[PDB]
């Protein structure tokens, strides 16, 4: 009787959920220790770091255990309820918007702090910066209220009455769904993508023409060598952002762009396995934003093993 149950076998399922659980534990412990560390002068970048860390901690701890509890093992008869599903996708879309806007404004603060630094001394202040943190949180909530305006419950049994056939799906029509998730992918992926990539290439270009041309001794090429390690910590953040938040948004828009005429059974199976892959990559990003901020800089490595042990 339970139709619309996909036959996903248990070996790949337990491999994916083991990847998920390892990702979750290392990501929540990393975001916990970096949030407590930044909770432990021009300190206008620590707020962006802590805000992105809190956004990653929030998306992990709110989506991921509920995600394994009612998305990979327990299929279409769910157990979280109407307010549960609507608030769950509200928090998911809000955390995605918050992580995207955190990448935007962190890259903007870096660009003002290097390529126009006197305008950062004039413009950027700790008070304003806290105002911008509250502003991007309120922008995430205001852009996630259409996720409250688009979600719902829908029975898709043989007569639409069975309590083992109701799913929690976008209940709006295909066109308005297209529009909301297309502006979702457009803003919350592409404008972060071009903004973070353009400003990080300009910052890396300014650093490379500051250490190569040098307008003096480079200091036996030691501090500028770790400045090229800073080029690595720039480029690694931007490539991690694009390579993690690209396929999730491609999967959202391939859910929008197909209207059952291009779906087959194998493409249904491939869509569900690709959904496990893209949410694996989202939890990858949620784990390796604090891991990228921790491991590649040895001072963070020492102080966080001092926090751990």
């Amino acid at each position: 009787n339970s139709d619309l149950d996909v036959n996903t076998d248990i070996y790949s399922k337990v491999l994916v959920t083991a990847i998920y659980l390892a990702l979750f534990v290392v990501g929540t412990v990393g975001n916990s220790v970096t949030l407590f560390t930044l909770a432990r002068l021009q300190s206008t970048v620590d707020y962006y770091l802590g805000s992105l860390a809190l956004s990653d901690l929030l998306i992990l701890l709110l989506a991921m255990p509920v995600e394994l509890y009612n998305f990979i093992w327990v299929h279409h008869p769910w157990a979280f309820g109407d307010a549960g599903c609507r608030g769950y996708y509200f928090l998911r879309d809000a955390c995605t918007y918050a992580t995207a806007l955190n990448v935007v404004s962190l890259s903007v603060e870096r660009y003002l702090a290097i390529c126009h630094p006197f305008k950062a001394k004039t413009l950027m202040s700790r008070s304003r910066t806290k105002k911008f943190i509250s502003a991007i949180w309120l922008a995430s909530a205001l852009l996630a209220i259409p996720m409250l305006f688009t979600m719902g419950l829908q029975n898709l049994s043989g007569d639409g009455t069975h309590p083992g056939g109701l799913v929690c799906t976008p209940i709006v029509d295909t066109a308005t769904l297209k529009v909301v998730i297309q502006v979702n992918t457009f803003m919350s992926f592409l404008f972060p993508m071009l903004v973070a990539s353009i400003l990080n290439t300009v910052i890396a270009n300014k650093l490379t023409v500051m250490v190569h041309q040098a307008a003096n001794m480079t200091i036996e090429p030691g501090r500028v060598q770790a400045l090229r390690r800073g080029v690595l910590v720039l480029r690694a953040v931007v490539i991690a952002f694009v390579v993690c938040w690209l396929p999730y948004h491609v999967r959202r828009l391939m859910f929008c762009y197909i209207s059952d005429e291009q779906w087959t059974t194998f493409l249904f199976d491939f869509y569900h396995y690709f959904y496990m892959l893209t949410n694996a990559l989202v939890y990858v990003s949620a784990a390796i934003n604090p891991i990228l901020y921790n491991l590649v800089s040895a001072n963070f490595r020492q102080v966080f093993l001092s926090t751990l042990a």
Binding site: L156, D260, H272
Partner: peptide, 6 residues
């Protein structure tokens, strides 16, 4: 046969 999970 359209997927429902987003």
């Amino acid at each position: 046969r359209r997927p429902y999970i987003l």
